[PDB]
Design a protein around this ligand. Sequence first.
Ligand code: HEM
Ligand SMILES: C[C@]12CC[C@H]3[C@@H](CCC4=CC(=O)CC[C@@]43C)[C@@H]1CC[C@@H]2O
Ligand SMILES: C[C@]12CC[C@H]3[C@@H](CCC4=CC(=O)CC[C@@]43C)[C@@H]1CC[C@@H]2O
Ligand SMILES: [Cl-]
Length: 454
Amino acid sequence: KEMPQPKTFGELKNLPLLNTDKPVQALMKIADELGEIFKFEAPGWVTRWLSSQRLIKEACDESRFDKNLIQALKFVRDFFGDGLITSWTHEKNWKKAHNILLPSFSQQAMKGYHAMMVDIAVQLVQKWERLNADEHIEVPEDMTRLTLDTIGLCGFNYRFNSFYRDQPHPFITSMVRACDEAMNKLQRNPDDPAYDENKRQFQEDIKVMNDLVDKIIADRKASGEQSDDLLTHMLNGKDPETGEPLDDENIRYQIITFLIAGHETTSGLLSFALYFLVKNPHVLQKAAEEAARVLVDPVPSYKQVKQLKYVGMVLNEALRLWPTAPAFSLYAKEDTVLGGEYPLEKGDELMVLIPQLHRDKTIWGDDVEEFRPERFENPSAIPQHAFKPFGNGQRACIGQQFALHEATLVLGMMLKHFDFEDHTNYELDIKETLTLKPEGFVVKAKSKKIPLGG
Ligand code: HEM
Ligand SMILES: C[C@]12CC[C@H]3[C@@H](CCC4=CC(=O)CC[C@@]43C)[C@@H]1CC[C@@H]2O
Ligand SMILES: C[C@]12CC[C@H]3[C@@H](CCC4=CC(=O)CC[C@@]43C)[C@@H]1CC[C@@H]2O
Ligand SMILES: [Cl-]
């Protein structure tokens, strides 16, 4: 059997089809046309895109497939090194870092992070209480302020102070400018001297990111207070399987890795959640009644956040529709056959298209486009490998609980303290970098004038 494949363009193959700002959304349309699996090929690489739970469930068998880092994106590996997201499972520093950092995401870790999450969430709420009547909120912008600050403080006892800035922190601006520059070069005569300033600017941006990391470490060595946080574990934690802590080189990569991965997809999630709420007033009202019922104190306790059941369903359902890291990659460990129809040679690449997996009518029913948090009412009824916003198996998201606790806390406080109005009747416009975010999403928030504790 031939595997489906969209149209080719000489020896550019399918590559011209990604001549777009929204390639993941373009790939979803192709998935709609061609079905559960299709080959997609470019000059320097080939892969197969999977969209059905039946094939993805096989792809997620770790005895047969492991995590792949895509060659086309080596600029990422360049910058994040052998940090946890950009290391191969077989690499030494993957397992070492994994075992050293897992305890930083334990239940006792989360309880320890809670008060500092609240510190940043109170800042977000206060910003919004202080807006004049004529004004509105820039939602992804403010969610990015919250998430960057929350990972900075909880993780590294460093304050980005993003709510004290009108534009994004220099780290974000440099991050976005670096990772944009690197991505544009994929289709560059890249060595043309016309691009020299592009390369000089790229250098300046890595130097901002690197100075920040240095400050974080230096502040920590100098510190007078006791921290037991993510950075504490990076510095001092020892690999049980061998007794050594990470070296300085790898630690630097973990810091940059956690600063970035630890904020971006969480800001997207909050933004999409708020979008879906304001487009679904009955759901908003239900989420709001919960918030008001559960958050009875002036600030939320860890336990109260665990009781926001419906807010958690809201978040899972936003991650169903628009998983903010929308794809991951796998390779075949040995020759094997997928779905009893598609032969694969050792090393062959697969891509999981998460948003399309999440619209598999076989699994979810026909109403896959509706925003229905009630689907997660009973979470053990969702088949295995049907819902994968946090990836797979031993290479699944280490920060998953951190992300959901932060998001639930913040969304709960937002819904306690304000009524939200989609005052422009916003039309969803999804911007794609390596993640997904609504662009230009704005709302008004009318305060309920509920005082906010310290
Ligand atoms: C809604 C929020 C988030 C989503 C949707 C998300 C998604 C993902 C996905 C899909 C992967 C697997 C990548 C792959 O297969 O190539 C992953 C891995 C990872 N995430 Fe997240 N993530 C989120 C939040 C966070 C947070 C808050 C942190 C850190 C505090 C974090 C740190 C990581 C790390 C370190 C990995 C690599 C795990 C390993 O291989 O050892 N993420 N995430
Ligand atoms: C984009 C991202 C950093 C880089 C990750 C991405 C998801 C998975 C992934 C696979 C790769 O092969 C390169 C690195 C990437 C592309 C991460 C999820 C959140 C973070 O912002
Ligand atoms: C989906 C993705 C963004 C879109 C990427 C995709 C890898 C394949 C690819 C190559 C490109 O050069 C741009 C578009 C795409 C199609 C990326 C893998 C992780 C990231 O989230
Ligand atoms: Cl509150």
